[PDB]
Design a protein around this ligand. Structure first.
Ligand SMILES: Cc1cc2nc3c(=O)[nH]c(=O)nc-3n(C[C@H](O)[C@H](O)[C@H](O)COP(=O)(O)OP(=O)(O)OC[C@H]3O[C@@H](n4cnc5c(N)ncnc54)[C@H](O)[C@@H]3O)c2cc1C
Ligand SMILES: CCCCCCCCCCCCCCCCCC(=O)O
Ligand SMILES: CCCCCCCCCCCCCCCCCC(=O)O
Length: 573
């Protein structure tokens, strides 16, 4: 209906992080008609603009409210896996931490034309940094905004840093500078613009909505990619979607000649939609009577996510009032006047904080790269599940209760060895995917050992003089949890997502049989079909995954507009 009689040069499935970048770059020269189909609504929520309101986005209407299959290995629990559902996607609902990982993470992909030396200029191009000028590792005029956090907990941030120094960890002045080792303690930069969320809707899509060659539909749930097995090769024709949920008429947006469909539905929904389109393991598609168009083993495999557990400790009675929970709420759960004023006057104070923007990368045992990320929070978890405690914190407002003053250290396996999957539980394209995070399933128990040693590291830091000055015992995991076996069980019962999720449409070299796309991001076995989102990441980098997604989208846009090629190698004689 809004696409009737229209031909598009690019159809983007999803309007999330990658999609906002592509919509911007691909519509730039005015020659090409670009359609964006987002299932969620427009990006207008105040809860998206205010970083501390991440607490309100979990388990909300702007989230997919996805739960995993029962995990036998995690005390037989379903795991919540937060995913943004609106223009800007998960960039609109995330913790805003700005990480690229290490040069070694990209070289470890071993994909031609995607080495650390290939990707660096694409990170730098995207970047405007308020605290790092132009140099080998920072750009200055890109659409992203990155800055040092504009909240500082004067006692607790300083005490964390001195405690990490007291246990002998080195500082890292810039976690995105590849001229030095990834490990160390310091401050995570944030995708914020003077303390307001700088999501990829705000930075890439919203500024160009005036473009007549760009059409963005919200409330538009893609149901499958339309693919024709005519001439003698599967050819994308366009995309089926409903603007009215499961009962809506199935509409078809149509490609112009030379048109491509680009999957931008993210590492959960892209492989889900490809399988509904006949692209996936033939046995899984047959299960639900989906005709096999491209028998591709890798689709929905290689799901990598960074699992988390935490410690938490209260402060002494005399340090009551010093935590971020005290900066945001008073003792009745009323939002502090000082926090509102600081946010509106100059974009500072507790409302600019996602809480978890100071920390460390640590090697638990002589690894080539750090296996542990620590996120320090100058406030106290009231649940061993940190995402649950954030939902609790949002619900706490106006309850007339006082949130106890304390700290948390979240431990993340940032370069995990476990993999999971995403597939189908039904033929209905509106049903939730069959989602398996696969936490703690690696053959050697490496991810569990990372988190157990993480808890020992957090206890060493909390015991050090600088922090123990403020603290008064331990709430989580608590004095009941001391042996290696007790810690493992605490981890199984409390492990939660740190919200990465990559690798379900793995990019790979020619000859790599686990790959779903080539190094041009083309889906194997289909013409005019690409994936440009977190799905394509072969091997997850350490740290949060948003900045690598924007880098991949920037480079794909350059490839599709003819501004760049990918690979590299001189022809053999
Ligand atoms: C709570 C949370 C915290 C995070 N913390 C951080 C952090 O601090 N820093 C960081 O860098 N990274 C963080 N991440 C990860 C980062 O946000 C993601 O890796 C990145 O945003 C993913 O980009 P994407 O384009 O691949 O997918 P998304 O941004 O998820 O975009 C996918 C889009 O597709 C849409 N979609 C799905 N199905 C359909 C359909 N059938 N039809 C139409 N549209 C559909 C979705 O609604 C969504 O808008 C976090 C993630 C979350 C969820
Ligand atoms: C954890 C609780 C998070 C609280 C966040 C909501 C705080 C509400 C403050 C009152 C609204 C402030 C004025 C509106 C600011 C609108 C967002 C913006 O335009 O940047
Ligand atoms: C925004 C400030 C809220 C304060 C809440 C109290 C402190 C709790 C720390 C929670 C445990 C670790 C952080 C969990 C981070 C969840 C966000 C994310 O993963 O994207």
């Amino acid at each position: 209906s809004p696409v009737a009689g229209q031909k598009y040069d690019y159809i983007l499935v999803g309007g999330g992080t990658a999609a906002c970048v592509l919509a911007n770059r691909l519509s730039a020269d005015g020659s090409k008609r670009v359609l964006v189909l987002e299932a969620g609504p427009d990006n207008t929520s105040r809860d998206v603009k205010i970083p501390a309101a991440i607490t309100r986005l979990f388990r909300s209407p702007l989230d997919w409210n996805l739960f995993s299959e029962l995990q036998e290995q995690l005390a037989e629990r379903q795991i919540y896996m937060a995913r943004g559902r609106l223009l800007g996607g998960s960039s609109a609902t995330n913790a805003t931490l700005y990480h690229r990982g290490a040069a070694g993470d990209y070289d470890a992909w071993g994909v031609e034309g995607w080495s650390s030396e290939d990707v660096l200029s694409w990170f730098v191009q995207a970047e405007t940094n308020a605290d790092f000028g132009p140099g080998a590792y920072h750009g200055s005029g890109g659409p992203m905004r990155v800055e040092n956090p504009r909240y500082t907990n004067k006692q607790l941030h300083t005490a964390f840093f001195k405690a990490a120094e007291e246990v002998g960890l080195t500082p890292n002045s810039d976690f995105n500078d590849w001229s030095h080792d990834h490990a160390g303690y310091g401050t995570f930069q944030v995708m914020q613009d003077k303390g307001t969320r700088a999501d990829m809707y705000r930075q890439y899509l919203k500024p160009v909505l005036g473009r007549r060659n760009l059409q963005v539909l919200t409330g538009a749930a893609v149901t499958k990619v339309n693919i024709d097995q005519a001439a003698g090769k599967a050819q994308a024709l366009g995309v089926e979607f409903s603007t009215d949920g499961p009962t809506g008429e199935r509409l078809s947006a149509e490609l112009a000649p030379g048109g491509e469909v680009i999957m931008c539905a993210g590492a959960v929904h892209t492989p889900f939609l490809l399988k509904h389109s006949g692209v996936g393991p033939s046995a899984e598609l047959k299960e639900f009577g989906i005709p096999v168009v491209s028998n591709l083993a890798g689709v929905g495999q290689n799901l990598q996510d960074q699992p988390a557990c935490l410690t938490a400790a209260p402060v002494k009675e005399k340090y009551d009032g010093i935590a971020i929970s005290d900066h945001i709420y008073n003792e009745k759960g009323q939002i502090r006047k000082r926090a509102i004023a600081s946010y509106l006057l100059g974009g500072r104070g507790g409302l600019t904080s996602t809480g978890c923007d100071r920390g460390a990368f640590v090697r638990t045992a002589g690894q080539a790269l750090p296996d542990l990320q620590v996120r320090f929070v100058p406030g106290m978890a009231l649940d061993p599940d940190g995402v649950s405690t954030y939902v609790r914190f949002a619900k706490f407002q106006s309850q007339g209760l006082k949130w106890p003053s304390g700290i948390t250290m979240q431990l993340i396996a940032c370069r995990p060895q476990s993999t999971g999957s995403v597939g189908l539980k039904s033929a209905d394209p509106f049903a939730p995917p069959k989602l398996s995070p696969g936490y703690l399933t690696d053959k050697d128990g490496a991810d569990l050992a990372t988190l157990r040693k993480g808890i020992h590291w957090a206890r060493d830091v909390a015991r050090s003089s600088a922090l123990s000055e403020y603290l008064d015992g331990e709430l989580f995991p608590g004095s009941g949890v001391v042996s290696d076996d007790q810690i493992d069980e605490y981890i199984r019962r409390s492990i939660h997502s740190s919200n990465a999720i990559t690798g379900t449409c793995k990019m790979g070299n020619a000859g790599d049989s686990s790959s779903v796309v080539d190094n041009q991001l083309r889906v194997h076995g289909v013409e005019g079909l690409r994936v440009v989102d977190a799905s394509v990441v072969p091997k997850i980098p350490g740290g949060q995954t948003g900045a690598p997604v924007v880098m991949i989208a920037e480079r794909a846009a350059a490839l599709l507009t003819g501004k760049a090629t990918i690979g590299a190698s001189a022809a053999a004689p």
